Paper text:
Although first discovered as a placental antigen present in the circulation during human pregnancy, the metzincin metalloproteinase PAPP-A (pregnancy-associated plasma protein-A, pappalysin-1, EC 3.4.24.79) is ubiquitously expressed in human tissues.
We find that the 2:2 PAPP-A·STC2 complex of ~500 kDa is a highly flexible structure with multiple contacts within and between the subunits. The 500 kDa 2:2 complex is composed of interacting homodimers, stabilized by many intra- and interchain disulfide bonds, several interdomain contacts, and several bound Ca2+ ions. Disulfide bonds link the two PAPP-A subunits and the two STC2 subunits, and a disulfide bond connecting each PAPP-A subunit with an STC2 subunit prevents dissociation of the complex. In particular, a specific disulfide bond between the subunits of STC2 and PAPP-A prevents dissociation, and interactions between STC2 and a module located in the very C-terminal end of the PAPP-A subunit prevent binding of its main substrate, IGFBP-4. This reflects the crossing of the PAPP-A polypeptides at the PAPP-A dimerization disulfide, between M6 and SCR1. However, this truncated variant is also able to dimerize with a C-terminal variant starting at M5, and such heterodimers are active toward IGFBP-418. These data underscore that the M5 and M6 domains, here identified as responsible for formation of the dimerization interface, are sufficient for functional dimerization, and that the PAPP-A dimer has a trans configuration, which is maintained upon formation of the PAPP-A·STC2 complex. We demonstrate that IGFBP-4 has an overlapping binding site in the C domain, consequently defining this region as a substrate-binding exosite, and STC2 as an exosite inhibitor. While devoid of activity towards IGFBP-4, the active site cleft of the catalytic domain is accessible in the inhibited PAPP-A·STC2 complex, as shown by its ability to hydrolyze a synthetic peptide derived from IGFBP-4.
Numbering used by the authors:
A (entry chain Q): 1133 to 1375
B (entry chain A): 44 to 211
C (entry chain C): 94 to 1213
Write the structure that this text describes.
């Protein structure tokens, strides 16, 4: 853009501002345009970064490196050499080759009710959607570290069972069973109040219901109940009694 | 010369704003035709309708309703030119005033209307021009009071200019 | 069989409790024909938990609604499901906007974990969000199945047939088998129900008050060999089909020397003097045309028509100069002229107020003859004051100095149906000599079409091929430079980077070019997009804007296009009465041991009956029905009695290029006023009305209105007050308000109207609505079609028929060949006989008996087959000629084909296309990090914030304009349920959420999963959120304030910082807002792929930097 010249600020140092989401652009030249015939410029200097350049960094894959000082991403021969025994908890390891030499592949697959958390050498935990990922001993290093985490079905709310209070002594983690108690006047009707949590992140079918009935209506003063069935305490929501 | 988008937004306001309140005349302000003070008209006269007597309140409500309703309905196939818009606005103002007896109600509250009228207000907007023009035709005592007031504020804000314009 | 017609007013039915309802798996399958303009959202059938007082959304619903609910534009089929175990509703919609008036087979399969919606037997939707059984048997009595529309009056308008339902999720093979049965009735263990509609009340019950629909007979479950050969994206008529254009390219018999009768119209004075064009010009131009088109088997019978009117010869026939224009205070170069008063003063600025004295003089003044002085108040236009031929610049006087070509055409009332009428005007524009009607235009066969030209160039040597270019316009030939210069923008789907039949000029032999006036190859920089240069541009082609001397040829594709357009559009123009041949080759349906069934296409013009003049049968259709377009239109003038009026736009066929937009080719309540005048608002609910009349009164069966635009604000009354049918009896049949869709035309069945009907009266209260055109279809065997004789056919084979058969005529377009021999090869063709006259024989088809053919369920790649669905219907994923349709990959024999995009599976070619299935693919991502910890401003057990942790359930769908936030929303998203709702304090509590992540890192963008956008139904304000990025040093990098919307959900917010500064590893994202109605179920860091200046700012030789892991760490190897 347009910048104001001054001998006091000479040599003028202008910072660079652009969208950091987009990669940079390797400046081959600097164009300075002006409407002043009296402007004389004796040199233009690129004041570069230390070691960062997202231009070629944007396109990098495992097996190739990025030179810090020169700031570009190029294929490399060495590096990635660390393959001990691949042990992943709560996971199945389908190893392409039993030996842990350079190029050995092993597909780690999370089991039922498990989330695949991928921990690599730095601060990027990317939980891949695919339960199975093949970690390769690329030149003798497992390119990714993997683990399987359990799952939970969250707490059951009133939508699960109406007119009930839910107690979860063991929580909601995979395998838990939460008990719903029918808050009065609701009553338990069924076989079991322990709703089970599966791997789906969602609770089991309601083996019992919490029925809410109004009790026998109090006798209206100076009035007699005309509905014979209403002497009972079993009156579902919306039951009518004529007085 | 009124902008087409202005026409669309004014008709949207009119079909949206109800008969009562400043809503009809609020959107009419800031138009390309520069006819201003309508929002000021509604705002000030709804301030001062309480100072007006009961017949004054009845007349002012009737006049506001007539202005909103008629100006909404007759805003039909008039040409885009602003002079026609100003002419029809003045015609509607005078029609509502005559059909709702502006003259006698003004006579009962000459001092109040003297209080509202300002030299800058008449210098700026043609609506208040129409109001004061009809006011000078609403009673000898009323026109005399209006002339005294307009002379007072005109000389206050003009000095010798008002006197030299008012030759005799 | 039988079918059920629903009027959409509530003719709903409940399934009787005598039949059980499936709990885990089911498959619904129904034939249907959906009328347009359904009340969105519209339901056709649904299961509801009638006892679930708070959550009625539990269950399943099928129907049609609009994608992008706001300003409804995409009416498509949909199915929604919510199992009782599931906490919310998932839903899916059709792949394309549904085509009304078509018999389609719709199915929906649920196996308990996979929800699938398939149209026409082809897969278009799959999902797996809802899992497990739909409901426990305990609530079985609560579930009720109710059809025809939801209890919310989300009814359906149209026809339903063969209501079938299995208790299992059938496979694609199974559903296609059921489709090819098309109404077979038999009991199966998995089939819950199979309704023949014979006794509906046996298994169904009506609504209250006897809201019962109508029962009719199914006309046809399916129709083979779909004749609806829709033209391509740039195609507008059947002439644009590749198959027919190839057939015309191969058949020189189809291109026998094309005698075309073209008429040139000339104007003289009253005494037959002062011709518009001299006879020498006419003869020279005719000779140039002949030299140009003999090599293309085209000859021109030159007819000359003369008109004599001195009162018109003196005046000026402006071209491209609208009468409504001029005096609009804006300079119009095409209207700038001295006889127009320099655009009526717009193109001539001067010190006007010095000529105010010239006003009121009663004598014309040039300075007063401008818009500012009202053109002297018409004094210059007054014939008595002065001459009007050079002074009347006011565009109101009937005695104006100038007119337009369209008004002259209205005066003339010529016979355009038999000749290409040629008119003359002033070509003010320099790029062309005039504007000509397209063959696909309304006026091509109407008396309004023609070619306007400048006599200054007509018959002039050196300028003679520009008229050839105008004729090329009139013959449907696109510009050879189209696709580069005529594009709307560089993203126009008609990019002609290479010469092709579907891009730009639609000719494979015309090289790409820009809008180049000279006849040389354009140099660098001539590209509008600038991407590519131009090679071997057809400047020698007559069509290019090259100079007329250099333009000297037409490419063979253009020749075939002209042949086809003459054969279809210009049937009445050519001499003789030879019947129209069949456009495309007949297709082999199927062969038995000794018999094979053959069908073919109707005539290209579509006239199945004799072409007799006067009688309406020249527009009769199959089944002895008639279909017509809007003949005449009128409406009342605002603020004026009566009104008369005659909007030609509202007449004829629909002509708008793109619906859901205000287009000038449509009638409008606004378009009936003076542009330089305030448009009066249409009156109170009597109905601002436009009336239409038809050329032939007739007993109708259905009506259709091509709406193009509608007000988006009020209710669902479609902005239409009422429809008033006009029968010959004089009765005004009211139809009430209807429902509109911005693209799909409104369709209405007219069963109750058994009387002769001539017109219609559409009543609307809209002040922005537009109507393009209208159309009417007659009942079966209407008396207007009985008296006339339908065309027949004769099938001829190589070798000829063994039995001496005269083809026994063909009125059903059907034949069966008894003479067959295994392995023998036969060539087939047909000739259309219109009584005694003989048409061009159809292209031959080579068939081998007992051999694989396109459509036998087995692919024959030697025939070029890409898919063999054993079906001859397009739109099922396999085209008519064994080529896989766009975006529909499939395998297997027969090819069970699916909409590959959006189903849920990603493949190699979906990486660059299906962001829905594969995500974004630029090198700045895109494996998104999801929240691991979530702290919120208002945390509660009812509405926890830790639901933001991780990716929320995709079954959650953003609800626009929420009345209130129920507890169901809180189970997946966090909103401030703890705080009360004081309207004097709800705008100050800045509710915020801090989504923390497992490991801090920068992100390319931010994903915000909005369950509720926070917008209130009664408020037009869209809530604003202050997004800030919290990094490792916990600095609150406030990205700023952004506007929420359910349409953009999941909202993608780009992230920008300063280059002079490094990144910052974002541990958490804080979203702050003043809206209590905002509920967010999760925030995702769209992580940068392989770059991070944070730790890169400290690197030295001997230590490396992990690209993807985006940090600089000491290393052991390398540097050797
Ligand atoms: Ca103009
Ligand atoms: Ca004059
Ligand atoms: Ca081409
Ligand atoms: Ca039209
Ligand atoms: Ca085949
Ligand atoms: Ca097919
Ligand atoms: Ca896909
Ligand atoms: Zn052209």
């Amino acid at each position: 853009g347009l910048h104001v010249l001054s001998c006091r600020n000479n040599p003028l140092i202008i910072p660079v501002v652009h969208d950091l989401s987009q990669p940079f652009y390797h400046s081959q030249a600097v164009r300075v345009s002006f409407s002043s015939p009296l402007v004389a410029i004796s040199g233009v200097a690129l004041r570069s970064f230390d070691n960062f350049d997202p231009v070629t960094l944007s396109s990098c894959q495992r097996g190739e490196t990025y030179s810090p000082a020169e700031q570009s991403c190029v294929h490399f021969a060495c590096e990635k050499t660390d393959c001990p025994e691949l042990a992943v908890e709560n996971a199945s390891l389908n190893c392409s080759s039993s030996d842990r030499y350079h190029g050995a592949q092993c597909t780690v697959s999370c089991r039922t009710g498990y989330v695949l958390q991928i921990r690599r050498d730095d601060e990027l935990i990317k939980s891949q959607t695919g339960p199975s990922v093949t970690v390769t001993c690329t030149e003798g290093k497992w390119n990714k570290q993997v683990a399987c985490e359990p799952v939970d079905c969250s707490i059951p709310d009133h939508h699960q069972v109406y007119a009930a209070s839910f107690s979860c002594p063991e929580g909601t983690t995979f395998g838990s069973q939460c008990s719903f108690q029918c808050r009065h006047p609701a009553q338990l009707k069924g076989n079991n109040s322990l709703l089970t949590c599966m791997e789906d992140g969602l609770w089991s079918f309601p083996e019992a219901l919490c029925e809410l009935m109004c009790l026998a209506p109090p006798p209206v003063p100076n009035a007699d109940l005309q509905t014979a069935r209403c002497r009972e305490n079993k009156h579902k929501v919306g039951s009518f009694c004529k007085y | 010369r009124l902008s087409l988008q202005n026409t669309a937004e004014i008709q949207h306001c009119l079909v949206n704003a109800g008969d009562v309140g400043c809503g009809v005349f609020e959107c009419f302000e800031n138009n390309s035709c520069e006819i201003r003070g309508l929002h000021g008209i509604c705002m000030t006269f709804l301030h001062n309708a309480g100072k007006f007597d009961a017949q004054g309140k009845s007349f002012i409500k009737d006049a506001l309703k007539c202005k909103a309703h008629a100006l909404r309905h007759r805003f039909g196939c008039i040409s885009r030119k602003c002079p026609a818009i100003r002419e029809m606005v003045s015609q509607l103002q005078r029609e509502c005033y005559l059909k709702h007896d502006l003259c006698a109600a003004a006579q009962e509250n000459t001092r109040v209307i003297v209080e509202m009228i300002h030299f800058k207000d008449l210098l700026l907007h043609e609506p208040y021009v129409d109001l004061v023009n009809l006011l000078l035709t609403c009673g000898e005592e009323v026109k005399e009071a209006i002339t005294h007031s307009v002379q007072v504020q005109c000389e206050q804000n003009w000095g010798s200019l008002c006197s030299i314009l008012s030759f005799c | 069989s039988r079918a059920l017609y629903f009027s959409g007013r509530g003719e709903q039915l409940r399934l009787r409790a005598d039949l059980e309802l499936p709990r885990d798996a089911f498959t619904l399958q129904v034939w249907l024909r959906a009328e347009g303009g359904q009340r969105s959202p519209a339901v056709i059938t649904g299961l509801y938990d009638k006892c679930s007082y708070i959550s009625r959304d539990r269950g399943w619903v099928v129907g049609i609604h609009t994608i992008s609910d706001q300003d409804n534009k995409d009416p498509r089929y949909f199915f929604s499901l919510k199992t009782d175990r599931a906490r919310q509703v998932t839903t899916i919609n059709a792949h394309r906007s549904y085509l009304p008036g078509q018999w389609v087979y719709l199915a929906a399969t649920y196996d308990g974990q996979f929800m699938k919606l398939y149209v026409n037997g082809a897969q278009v939707a799959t999902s797996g969000e809802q899992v497990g059984g739909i409901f426990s048997p305990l609530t079985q009595k609560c579930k009720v199945l109710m059809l025809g529309g939801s209890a919310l009056n989300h009814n359906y308008r149209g026809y339903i047939e063969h209501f079938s339902l299995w208790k299992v999720a059938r496979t694609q093979r199974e559903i296609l088998s059921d489709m090819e049965t098309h109404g077979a009735h038999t009991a199966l263990p998995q089939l819950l129900l199979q309704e023949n509609w014979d006794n509906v009340k046996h298994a169904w019950s009506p609504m209250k008050d006897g809201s019962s629909p109508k029962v009719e007979f199914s006309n046809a479950h399916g129709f083979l060999l779909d004749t609806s050969l829709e033209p391509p994206l740039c195609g507008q008529t059947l002439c644009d089909n590749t198959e027919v254009i190839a057939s015309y390219n191969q058949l020189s018999s189809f291109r026998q020397p094309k005698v075309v009768r073209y008429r040139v119209v000339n104007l003289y004075e009253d005494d037959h003097k002062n011709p518009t064009v001299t006879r020498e010009q006419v003869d020279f131009q005719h000779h140039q045309l002949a030299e140009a088109f003999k090599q293309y088997n085209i000859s021109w019978e030159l007819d000359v028509l003369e008109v004599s009117n001195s009162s018109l010869r003196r005046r000026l026939i402006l071209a491209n100069c609208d009468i409504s224009k001029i005096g609009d205070e804006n300079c119009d170069p095409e209207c700038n002229h001295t006889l127009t008063g320099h655009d009526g003063g717009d193109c001539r600025h001067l010190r006007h107020p010095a000529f105010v004295k010239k006003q009121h003089n009663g004598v014309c003044d040039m300075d007063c003859n401008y818009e500012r002085f009202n053109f002297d108040g018409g004094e210059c236009c007054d014939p008595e004051i002065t001459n009007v031929t050079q002074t009347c610049f006011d565009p109101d006087s009937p005695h104006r100095a100038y007119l337009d070509v369209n008004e002259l055409k209205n005066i003339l009332k010529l016979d355009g149906s038999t000749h290409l009428n040629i008119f003359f005007a002033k070509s003010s524009e320099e790029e062309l000599a005039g504007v000509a009607t397209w063959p696909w235009d309304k006026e091509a066969l109407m008396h309004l079409g023609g070619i306007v030209l400048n006599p200054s160039f007509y018959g002039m040597p050196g300028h003679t091929h520009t008229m050839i270019h105008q004729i090329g316009h009139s013959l449907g030939l696109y510009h050879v430079f189209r696709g580069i210069s005529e594009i709307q923008s560089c993203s126009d789907p008609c990019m002609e980077t290479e010469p092709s039949f579907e891009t730009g000029d639609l000719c494979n032999d015309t090289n790409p070019a820009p809008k180049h006036k000279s006849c040389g190859d354009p140099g660098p920089g001539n590209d509008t997009c600038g991407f590519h240069s131009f090679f071997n541009t057809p400047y020698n082609n007559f069509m290019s804007y090259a100079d007329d001397d250099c333009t000297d040829s037409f490419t063979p594709n253009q020749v075939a296009r002209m042949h086809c357009y003459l054969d279809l559009v210009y049937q009445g123009w050519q001499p003789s009465r030879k019947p129209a041949p069949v456009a495309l080759a007949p297709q082999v349906l199927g062969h038995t041991t000794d018999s094979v069934t053959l069908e073919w296409f109707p005539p290209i013009d579509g006239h199945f009956f004799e072409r007799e003049l006067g009688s309406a049968c020249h527009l009769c259709l199959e089944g002895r029905i008639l279909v017509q377009y809007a003949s005449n239109a009128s409406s009342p003038m605002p603020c004026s009695p009566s009104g008369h009026w005659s909007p030609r736009e509202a007449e004829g066929h629909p002509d708008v290029e793109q619906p859901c937009k205000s287009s000038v080719r449509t009638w409008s309540p606004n378009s009936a006023v003076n542009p330089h005048t305030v448009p009066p608002a249409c009156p109170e609910p009597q109905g601002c009305y436009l009336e239409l009349e038809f050329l032939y009164p007739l007993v109708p069966e259905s009506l259709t209105i091509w709406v193009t635009f509608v007000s988006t604000d009020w209710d669902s009354s479609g902005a239409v007050n009422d429809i008033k049918l006009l029968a010959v009896s004089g009765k005004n049949i009211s139809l009430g308000p209807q429902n509109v869709f911005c693209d799909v035309p409104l369709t209405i069945r007219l069963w109750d109207v058994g009387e002769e009907v001539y017109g219609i009266q559409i009543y609307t209260l809209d002040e922005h609505l537009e109507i393009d055109a209208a159309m009417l279809t007659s009942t079966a065997d209407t008396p207007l079609c009985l008296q006339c004789k339908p065309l027949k056919y004769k099938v001829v084979r190589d070798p000829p028929l063994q039995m001496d058969v005269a083809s026994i005529l063909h009125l059903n377009r059907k034949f069966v060949d008894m003479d067959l021999n295994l392995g023998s090869v036969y060539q087939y063709w047909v000739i259309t006989i219109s009584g005694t006259e003989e048409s061009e024989p159809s292209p031959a088809v080579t068939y081998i008996h007992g051999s694989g053919y396109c459509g036998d369920g087995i692919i024959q790649k030697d025939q070029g087959e890409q898919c063999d669905d054993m079906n001859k219907i397009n739109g099922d994923g396999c085209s008519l000629f064994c080529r896989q349709e766009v975006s529909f990959n499939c395998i297997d024999e027969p090819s069970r084909c699916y909409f590959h995009d959006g189903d849920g599976v990603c493949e190699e070619f979906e990486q660059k296309t299906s962001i829905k299935d594969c995500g974004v693919y630029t090198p700045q991502g895109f494996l998104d990090q999801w929240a691991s910890n979530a702290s919120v401003s208002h945390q509660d057990q009812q509405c926890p914030g830790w639901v933001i942790i991780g990716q929320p359930a995709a079954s959650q769908v953003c609800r626009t304009k929420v009345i209130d936030l129920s507890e169901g929303i809180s189970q997946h998203a966090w909103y401030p349920c703890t705080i009360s709702y004081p309207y004097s304090q709800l705008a100050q509590t800045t509710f915020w959420l801090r989504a923390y992540f497992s490991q801090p890192m920068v992100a390319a963008a931010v994903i915000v999963h909005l369950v509720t956008d926070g917008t209130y139904y009664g408020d037009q304000k869209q809530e604003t959120i202050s997004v800030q990025l919290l990094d490792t040093k916990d600095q609150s990098h406030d990205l700023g304030l952004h506007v929420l919307s359910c349409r953009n959900n999941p909202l993608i917010i780009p992230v920008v910082h300063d280059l002079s500064q490094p990144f910052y590893h974002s541990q958490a994202v804080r979203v702050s807002f003043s809206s209590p109605l905002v509920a967010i179920s999760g925030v995702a860091l769209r992580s940068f792929d392989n770059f991070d200046p944070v730790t890169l700012s400290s690197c030295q030789r001997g230590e490396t930097y992990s690209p993807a892991e985006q940090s600089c760490v000491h290393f052991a190897c390398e540097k050797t």
